[PDB]
Design a protein around this ligand. Structure first.
Ligand code: HEM
Length: 214
């Protein structure tokens, strides 16, 4: 379509379906998830977000990303640190896993932030809109299938405290994305990079699924 936000949505319709069909996601969607499985997804998010945030900070002032730079509304590292401290204990940093599929996602994130910054928006869009649109849902499934204590911790990641309205923020985020200036070629590589982002998530699911099944 005309607007980038609309173009991205239509073009990733397919890989999104493949994302939904990933055995791991498929199971999670069925309210079928275990502590160990959830723990792995949280560690995964931590590594992904640490890398994504580093690259955003590196390019926050570039016109290829500045419009979608929302440090207060979207930072997630802190929330994940809080959550991992609950899921893995005070020494979480020393025991959390860092698998090949997690490494690969991190690798592309850095390659994009360092050598192809024009495409960073594709990764931010995929990650943030994914976590913003499906967050609240997975949080529910989680607290229903995890039966965690009233410790009041472990799911902070699923709540963006600095966004009063998810619907309204997404409208603003799409507008900022559509305000980005890009040639037809860059526009196309951004669309293709969005597909790569989904694929990296799909590859992560496939890996986590095989690890859990042993
Ligand atoms: C069983 C799993 C999943 C379900 C049921 C699901 C469902 C949906 C639904 C219903 C929407 C809202 C569409 C709308 O009303 O406009 C959405 C949006 C979105 N999802 Fe998912 N999703 C799943 C997994 C994922 C995954 C794994 C990713 C990527 C890692 C992802 C990325 C996105 C993105 C980027 C959007 C924003 C679309 C846009 O407005 O451009 N989703 N998803």
């Amino acid at each position: 379509p005309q607007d980038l936000s609309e173009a991205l949505k239509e073009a990733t319709k397919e890989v999104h379906t493949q994302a939904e069909n990933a055995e791991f996601m498929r199971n999670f969607q069925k309210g079928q998830v275990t502590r160990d499985g959830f723990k792995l997804v949280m560690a995964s998010l931590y590594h992904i977000y640490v890398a994504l945030e580093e690259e955003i900070e590196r390019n926050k002032e570039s016109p290829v990303f500045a419009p979608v730079y929302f440090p207060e509304e979207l930072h997630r590292k802190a929330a994940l640190e809080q959550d991992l401290a609950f899921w893995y204990g005070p020494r979480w940093q020393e025991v959390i896993p860092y698998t090949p599929a997690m490494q690969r996602y991190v690798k592309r994130l850095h390659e994009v932030g360092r050598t192809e910054p024009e495409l960073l928006v594709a990764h931010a869009y995929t990650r943030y809109l994914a976590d913003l649109s499906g967050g609240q849902v997975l949080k529910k499934i989680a607290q229903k299938a995890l039966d965690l204590p009233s410790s009041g911790e472990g799911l902070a990641f699923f709540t963006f405290p600095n966004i009063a309205s998810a619907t309204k923020f997404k409208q603003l985020y799409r507008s900022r994305m559509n305000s980005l200036e890009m040639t037809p070629a860059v526009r196309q590589r951004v669309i293709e990079e969005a597909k790569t982002a989904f694929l990296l998530n799909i590859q992560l699911f496939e890996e986590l699924q095989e690890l859990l099944t042993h």
